[PDB]
Every structure is written in structure tokens, then in C-alpha cells.
Subunit: 76 residues, 3 copies
């Protein structure tokens, strides 16, 4: 399991949550906007691909992503 | 040391902070999406206690390994 | 690469972002509860520099001051950029 911290532009935010849900990822937003995204190790590449694809220029556009190891995952 | 990310509903939020304080855990609340995310630093032993509180007062939880922890503190008169 | 979570007092916040930019660190500020939380991506070597800034830029409120920091390992880092 991996925890992904994705920092993206506000402009990109809404469409990225749509794309992330569409792709079956559970995500959380905190305002640039920061997304926290839990994924299984295999699905990581898919997630990045979505993020890459949904980051556009406002003239300039970008996204920064961190992939963090998870000791354990729990859903209650 | 572990860093715990807990995503919970607002309805659960206020009670959980009360329960978390009560249990001697230092926590931080972020208003997110309508949900709240709690970041909870804990020692490896106390992790189970923390999870139990969350479970009982609600949720999705991640337990992250911490390379290094630091606290700086000052008093003056 | 390391991800740093720094919880600091609001009063310290603006000055710490100034100091963190000045030191060439990219940081992100979250409004939280009272305290502000900074997320700071850094290379393993620069970690000590970052801590020092945080330590230095935490002052006493009112009498009392403090900051709490977590340094998290990063499996992988990714950056995507475009111009038009």
C-alpha cells in the first residue's frame, strides 16, 4: 500500500478529483491544492498517469508528487 | 515513532479529538473533502491504542513510518 | 528524498515561509488546529538545514514557544511541468 501526496494547481483540482474517482481511487483534498491518495502498490503508475494527464497550464502548469510507504492500512 | 493519517467524517470529528486528547495523543485537524483529516504522531507501542480510539469513535487510516522526530521547546521570563 | 511535516504556531508561520523560501526549500502551508502545518520536500542531505531553519524561526508566544517535526521517507518523487 502507498500514500501519495500530490500537490497540484487549483485550476487542476476539480477535474483531477473527477478523474481520480472515475479511476476508482479514494482521495482527499486540502487547500495550490494537496491531494492525499491511498493506493495499492500496483495501481501507483495508474494514479501518476491520471495526475500527469490532468495537470495543464493555467502559460505554466505542473504537479509534484510524493509516494510514501505505508506500514499498515485500516478501514473501519 | 509513527505518523497516523486518519480520514473521518465531521460528525465523528469533534468527539474523536475529545477522545484523542483524553487518551493523551497529540493530534492535528484539517478540514478536507466534507471530511476531516487527523495527523497523529505516536510512539510504536501506542499505535494500537490510537487505532482503537478511532475505531470506537467512528474511517480510513494510514500508519506511516517516521525516519526521524524532532521537538524544539522554549520558555522565557 | 524526505518529506517533512512541521507543525508550528501561526505567529511563526509567515516568517518561517519567508526563511524557507530564502533557504531554497519548497513548502506548502495548511490551515489547521491554532498551529500551521508545513509540508516540506527535501533531499536527504538538506534535511539538517531545514530543521535548523524551523528551530531558529520558532519564537515564544505572549513566554513559550515550540515546534514539532516529522521526517518521512519517500519511496519516489515525481514532477511534471509544461509551458504554453
Amino acid at each position: 500500500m502507498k500514500l501519495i501526496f500530490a500537490i497540484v494547481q487549483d485550476q487542476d483540482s476539480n477535474r483531477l478529483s473527477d478523474a481520480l474517482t472515475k479511476g476508482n481511487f479514494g482521495a482527499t483534498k486540502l487547500a495550490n491544492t494537496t491531494f492525499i491518495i491511498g493506493t495499492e502498490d500496483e495501481r501507483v503508475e495508474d494514479a501518476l498517469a491520471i495526475i500527469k494527464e490532468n495537470c495543464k497550464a493555467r502559460q505554466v502548469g505542473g504537479a509534484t508528487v510524493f509516494v510514501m510507504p505505508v506500514e499498515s492500512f485500516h478501514h473501519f
